[PDB]
Design a protein around this ligand. Structure first.
Ligand SMILES: [Zn+2]
Ligand SMILES: [Zn+2]
Lengths: 30, 22, 30, 22, 22, 30, 30, 30, 22, 30, 22, 22
C-alpha cells in the first residue's frame, strides 16, 4: 500500500482517499 | 501516538489510518 | 461523483494549509 | 452551512475556508 | 476495463483502484 | 481535454498511494 | 495557519491559495 | 468559479515543474 | 495569449507550458 | 526544468506531465 | 531573504507570503 | 539505477524521466 511516512498534505490526502464518503479528522498538534 | 507520530513520524497501514475516519 | 471528489481533494489540501495547528474535521453532507 | 456546497460551486477565500477550522 | 472511463465519471474506491496495481 | 487530464493527475496520485511497492502502469485508452 | 516550511510545489500552492485573484511570482533562484 | 480555480492549481504545479530555475509569474486575466 | 484560456479548456503540453516561464 | 529530486507522489506527477498521452510505468521497488 | 529562504528554508506567516502576491 | 535512484535519490532531466514513458 504505502509502507511509507505520510506527512503534511500527503497525510490528509491519504486520509481523504482511504476514508471516502465517511470523512476524517486531522489534528497535527501531537 | 497521535496521527503524525503514528503515520508521519512512523508508518501506518490502511488499518492505522482507518482509525481517524469519521 | 467526480470533479466533486476532485474538488474535495483540493479542499482538505486547502484546509490543511488554512487551519494548521487548530486542525479540522471533514464532514460531507451533514 | 455545508463544505462541498459553497466551496465547490463557489470559490471559498482563505477567510471562508477558515470557517471550517477547529 | 479502462481507467479514465470508470474512475473519472464514477468514483473508484480504494478497492476499485487496486484493480490497477501490479 | 481538461478536467480529464485534471482527473488523471488525481488517479496516478491515488494509484501511487493505493499500489505502493507493487507499482503500476498507466495506460490511457488501451 | 502553517507554522511550517513550505518547499517546492507546496510553496507555490500556498501562494496560489493565499494570493487568490491577484496572482503571484515564484523565483526559486535565491 | 471552480474547476477553473481547480485547473489553476494544476497549472502553477505544472509551471513549477516546467519552469524551475527560470521561475514564473502567474497573471490571471491580463 | 492568456493562461487559463488555452490550458484550462485545451491541454497544454510541456512545450506550450514553457511559453509561460521566465 | 527541475534540477531537483522528485520523490514519492511528486515523481509520478512529473512522469504524468512529461509523458502526456503516452503514459508511464512507476516501480518504486529499486 | 528570498522566497525559499524566507518560507522554505524558514517559516513565513500569511504576512510573509503576501509579499509575493501581484 | 531504477526510477527512484535515478530521479528521487538523484537528479534526472527531461531526458532521464522520458525513459519511463510508455
Ligand atoms: Zn511533498
Ligand atoms: Zn484537481
Amino acid at each position: 500500500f504505502v509502507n511509507q511516512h505520510l506527512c503534511g498534505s500527503h497525510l490528509v490526502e491519504a486520509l481523504y482517499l482511504v476514508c471516502g464518503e465517511r470523512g476524517f479528522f486531522y489534528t497535527p498538534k501531537t | 501516538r497521535g496521527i503524525v507520530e503514528q503515520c508521519c513520524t512512523s508508518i501506518c497501514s490502511l488499518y492505522q489510518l482507518e482509525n481517524y475516519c469519521n
